[PDB]
Amino acid sequence: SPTAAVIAEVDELREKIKGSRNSFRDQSFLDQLAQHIADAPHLGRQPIARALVEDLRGYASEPRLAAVKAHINEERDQHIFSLFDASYFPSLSLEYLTYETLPTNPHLAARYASPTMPVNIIASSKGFQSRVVVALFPENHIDGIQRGDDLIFYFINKFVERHNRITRKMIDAVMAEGSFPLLRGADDRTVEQASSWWVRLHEYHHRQGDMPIPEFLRYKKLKPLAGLEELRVDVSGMLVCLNDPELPADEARLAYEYILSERLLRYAVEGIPRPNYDAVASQLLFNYLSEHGGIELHGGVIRLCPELPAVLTEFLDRIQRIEQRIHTTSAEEVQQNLLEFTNRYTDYDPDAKDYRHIPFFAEIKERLGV
């Protein structure tokens, strides 16, 4: 396999530089790395490798990976190759992958446009094989730069895997019979499509509203607030799938079921021993929906009420009322009010200043090992 030969070369260079992350911007190291990439029999031939070599060789004057990113962003081919430094994707150093794109609904791509690339990984170097690495953002490159039109990649094959391994099991164990009818027995190509809708809507809505990110990112990194912002955009996407009549009805209801099942179940159990940011927000959703009539618990089993669309709309309306006050108060004051809202519906420990898994999902974590 030609691609296996290329990836073998990347993986061997990756091994050699594993102890040198502190030198990844040192020009002496970069010159040596660049020279080794250039001399790699198969890798060095590749246009994208020549671009990186040029970027690396010039880094002391221009600390940018402009040529590599121009290649990627223009989709000159379906390869990604660069030097990465992403603190939350620690497995990534010198990495390579080949991807395949997924079909997109024309109305979705036009009306909710963003530079998002839902793809399947065909082959990749070792750092990309970690289950941690589910996406790739422009600032993950060593230059740390992101522009609004840089392509952002989501590895949909990994979300399909997570849905099949975790979400399906949770639907069967936690939800009333018939809760997610379109998802039952749905094949991978179907979940793949719904997942691609989900990430497209996710990226689009992050940039909408009165406190979009990246503009207000540094106010939305505390665990509960990072989770709440995730939930704001995924509820927004849920409601688009319910309300936008220009989306194909069958595909939109599937995407709705998918986003709802992911946020109501899989994300709700994430994190050990404490909920991570996604789980805090998903437990907020669980308790809000329970309290406000969107779901019901009958003997430990979740029923989706027919009124759930109205309650999801009320929930998003409530978040938007809190954020709208950015126009008349400080971002710090809005933060405090977002936290107060979160804490009314989660298990916040004031002395630890952190959260506990609410008992409902703690028991599910125990029962299913999730």
Ligand X SMILES: C[C@H](O)[C@H](O)[C@H]1CNc2nc(N)[nH]c(=O)c2N1
Ligand Y SMILES: CC[C@H](C)[C@H](N)C(=O)O
| Contact residues: its own copies, CB under 8 A | 18-19, 21, 87-88, 90-91, 130, 132, 218, 221-223, 226, 270-274, 276, 299-300, 347, 349, 351-354, 356-357, 359, 362-363, 366
Instruction: Judge residue 275's burial from the number of C-beta atoms within 10 Å of its C-beta, 0-12 exposed, 13-18 middle, 19 or more buried.
Output: buried
Q: How far is the CB of 165 from ligand Y (least distance, A)?
A: 13
Question: Binding of ligand Y at residue 134 (CB under 6 A)?
Answer: yes
Question: Binding of ligand Y at residue 143 (CB under 6 A)?
Answer: no
What are the C-alpha distances in Å from 364 to residues 300, 305, 324, 367, 368? 10, 21, 36, 5, 6
Select 10 or 80, whichever has its Cβ closest to ligand X. 80
Which residue from 179, 284, 156, 307 is spatially nearest to 231, judged by alpha carbons? Answer: 284
Rounded CA-CA distance 106/128 in Å is 30
Residue selected from 202, 220, 232, 357 as contacting ligand Y according to rule CB under 6 A: 202
Tell how strand 152-155 and strand 116-124 pair up: parallel
Residue 192, binding choice from its own copies, ligand Y, ligand X, none, Cβ under 5 to 8 Å by partner class: none
Select 59 or 155, whichever has its Cβ closest to ligand X. 155
Q: How far is the CB of 115 from its own copies (least distance, A)?
A: 24
Residue 300, binding choice from ligand X, ligand Y, its own copies, none, Cβ under 5 to 8 Å by partner class: its own copies
For residue 240, give both structure tokens. Answer: 């688009």
What are the C-alpha distances in Å from 85 to residues 24, 38, 210, 213, 317? 8, 21, 31, 21, 38
Q: How far is the CB of 39 from its own copies (least distance, A)?
A: 24
Q: Is 96 helix (H, G, I), strand (E, B) or coil?
A: strand
Residue selected from 229, 230, 323, 347 as contacting ligand Y according to rule CB under 6 A: 230
Question: Binding of ligand X at residue 203 (CB under 6 A)?
Answer: yes
Residue 134, binding choice from its own copies, ligand Y, ligand X, none, Cβ under 5 to 8 Å by partner class: ligand Y
Question: Binding of ligand X at residue 152 (CB under 6 A)?
Answer: yes
> What is residue 84's DSSP assignment?
B
Rounded CA-CA distance 92/129 in Å is 10
Rounded CA-CA distance 216/327 in Å is 13
Residue selected from 45, 131, 147, 221 as contacting ligand X according to rule CB under 6 A: 221
Using CB under 6 A as the binding rule, the residues of this chain from 257 to 316 that contact ligand Y are: 278
Select 46 or 167, whichever has its Cβ closest to ligand Y. 167
Q: How far is the CB of 276 from its own copies (least distance, A)?
A: 6
Rounded CA-CA distance 207/260 in Å is 21
Give phi and psi for 6, each to the nearest 5: -65, -50
Residue 213, binding choice from its own copies, ligand X, ligand Y, none, Cβ under 5 to 8 Å by partner class: ligand X
Residue selected from 158, 163, 200, 220 as contacting ligand X according to rule CB under 6 A: 220
Rounded CA-CA distance 206/120 in Å is 23
Residue 25, binding choice from ligand Y, its own copies, ligand X, none, Cβ under 5 to 8 Å by partner class: none
Select 249 or 272, whichever has its Cβ closest to ligand X. 272
Candidates 93-101, 175-183, 213-221, 248-256: pick the segment binding ligand X (CB under 6 A). 213-221
Q: Taking the alpha carbons of 268, 272, 273, 275 in that order, is the dihedral positive or negative?
A: negative
Select 56 or 259, whichever has its Cβ closest to ligand Y. 259
- Reading across the β-sheet that carries 116-124, which strands appear in turn? 79-83, 94-101, 116-124, 152-155, 135-136
Q: Is 302 helix (H, G, I), strand (E, B) or coil?
A: strand
